[PDB]
Design a protein around this ligand. Structure first.
Ligand SMILES: Nc1nc2c(ncn2[C@H]2C[C@H](O)[C@@H](COP(=O)(O)NP(=O)(O)OP(=O)(O)O)O2)c(=O)[nH]1
Ligand SMILES: [Mg+2]
Ligand SMILES: [Mg+2]
Ligand code: NA
Ligand code: NA
Length: 326
DNA sequence: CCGACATCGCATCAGC
DNA sequence: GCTGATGCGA
DNA sequence: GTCGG
């Protein structure tokens, strides 16, 4: 945490621009800046030194100079005192309440947790579950709990069909000592890029997990992506575990390596890698890496036999999951 | 200077 | 109902 | 907000 003060500031500015200003590119700018500073192996002494890093320009160098000199940012201090910004920033912390809805709720006089709790009928389903578990979703998950959760998910999936493979990705796969949620990549040989020979592949799994009272709530659910809530079982006389966010993503079996690269992240690592791909003349998603033709239209999927193959195409040296925490 | 900034699944709405 | 845009989270 | 062309 060499430059924690600076990266915290930039993250709060990023959050401001996303939630309040609804300026997603500023949000991404601040996030890129914070990320590149987070991995810089020196205690930054000035905005000039920081400006050397890619993603840090003039405006952010100035803010860093102000922050180093005073320990504060006046811009952020005023934002913190703004009632409307404070209200919007708070509401967006509920899952399902984004910048537009947050501002709309404020317009209608709904701006506190207590307000939300007495206006449950003005929330959509996602938002109501997000409110329900507002407290729990703030808490992080120790890796030890992540390991118990893994063991339940993998074993219940096996019981449905032994040909399923479930892989825990996200921050867990990057070796994090704690995670914000659980991310599960799912494959089955019946679902490939060429065909789907069995329906309800994801549904079966979701249902098995509900059956054993592991999955407790659903935020959204389609053919390939589940987003919901789960909970570890507790023992006699002990306080229950917090409820946790869990996502399950079914990916075509033959596109596992693009899928696991994507779901391992980080989110900023993925954006940076896909950015780099574009400069090298490719586009990468969770399914494929494709060349960009003379037009700027994606060509046919390239052969991929490992995560490293994807790195190879764009002339990046391979990075292990633990080194992708950007 | 200025266009372009990764990419996509699900829920919801607007228009037909 | 279909299509396409928007919001949201990932 | 930043930066390559
Ligand atoms: N390409 C791309 N991938 C993303 C993005 N957001 C998430 N992913 C991919 C890569 C992410 O790693 C993965 C899961 O997203 P989380 O659970 O939101 N983040 P994580 O598990 O890393 O951290 P933690 O849960 O401890 O907070 O989905 C995105 O904006 N873009
Ligand atoms: Mg996660
Ligand atoms: Mg997640
Ligand atoms: Na820079
Ligand atoms: Na939210």
């Amino acid at each position: 945490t060499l430059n924690g003060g600076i990266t915290d500031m930039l993250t709060e500015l990023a959050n401001f621009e996303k939630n309040v200003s609804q300026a997603i590119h500023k949000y991404n700018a601040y996030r890129k800046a914070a990320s590149v500073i987070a991995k810089y192996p020196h205690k930054i002494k000035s905005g000039a030194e920081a400006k050397k890093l890619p993603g840090v320009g003039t405006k952010i160098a100035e803010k860093i100079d102000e922050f180093l000199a005073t320990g504060k940012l006046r811009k952020l201090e005023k934002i913190r005192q703004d009632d409307t910004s404070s209200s919007i920033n708070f509401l967006t912390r509920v899952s399902g309440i984004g910048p537009s809805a947050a501002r709309k709720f404020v317009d209608e006089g709904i701006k506190t947790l207590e307000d939300l709790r007495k206006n449950e009928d003005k929330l959509n389903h996602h938002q109501r579950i997000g409110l329900k578990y507002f407290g729990d979703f703030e808490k992080r998950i120790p890796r030890e709990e992540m390991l118990q959760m893994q063991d339940i998910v993998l074993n219940e999936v096996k019981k449905v069909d032994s040909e399923y493979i479930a892989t825990v990705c996200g921050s867990f796969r990057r070796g994090a000592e704690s995670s914000g949620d659980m991310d599960v990549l799912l494959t089955h040989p019946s679902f490939t890029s060429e065909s789907t020979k069995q329906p309800k592949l994801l549904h079966q799994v979701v249902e098995q997990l509900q059956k054993v009272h592991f999955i407790t709530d659903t935020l959204s659910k389609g053919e390939t992506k589940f987003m919901g809530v789960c909970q570890l079982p507790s023992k006699n006389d002990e306080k229950e575990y917090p409820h946790r966010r869990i996502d399950i993503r079914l990916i075509p079996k033959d596109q596992y390596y693009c899928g696991v690269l994507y779901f391992t992240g980080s989110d900023i690592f993925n954006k940076n890698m896909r950015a780099h791909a574009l400069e090298k003349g490719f586009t990468i998603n969770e399914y494929t890496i494709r060349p960009l033709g003379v037009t700027g239209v994606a060509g046919e999927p390239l052969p991929v036999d490992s995560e490293k193959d994807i790195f190879d195409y764009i002339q990046w040296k391979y990075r292990e999951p633990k080194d992708r925490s950007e």
